[PDB]
Amino acid sequence: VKVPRNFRLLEELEEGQKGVGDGTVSWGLEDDEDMTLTRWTGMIIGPPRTNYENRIYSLKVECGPKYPEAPPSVRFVTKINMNGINNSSGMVDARSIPVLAKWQNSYSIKVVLQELRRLMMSKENMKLPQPPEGQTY
Fold it and tell me: Which CATH number belongs to the domain containing residue 35 in this structure?
């Protein structure tokens, strides 16, 4: 048990439940019995005025023993065509996502999801053709 890690992830769990940010991303435990607070799920509402519009993206986020000193691992469940996301596995490439590539220990699951949503509206992603609704990895 690392007290600082566990305190932090309980704070994030509470923030997840209270709602924070602008409402367009959410996060929670993958299984509410995981007292290790390692496996999370995330939601991103697909941004209007992009090809992600009218879709809700499901993600998995893993916060290992070094979190939040070390960045989490992220994978899309919902199929997505987006830079930095392996089109075959759904794994997020940390080096293509600035907040993962340049992780700071003040960052959070929230910040990661917010960053991914921002990148969905970038010119290089926003008009990518997308797989049919409902497909997953």
Answer: 3.10.110.10
Q: How far is the C-alpha of 19 from the C-alpha of 28, rounded, in Å? A: 11
Query: Which range of residues forms the domain containing residue 129?
Result: 1-137
Long-range contacts of 2-7 (CB under 8 A, 24+ apart): 2/65, 5/37, 5/63, 5/65, 5/66, 5/67, 5/68, 6/37
Q: Residue 96 has which token pair?
A: 């293509």
Way it was determined: X-ray
Resolution of the PDB structure in angstroms: 1.7
CB 109 within 8 A of CB 25: no
Give the tokens for residue 115. 């960053």
- Within 8 A by CB and 6+ apart from 64, the residues are 38, 70, 72, 73
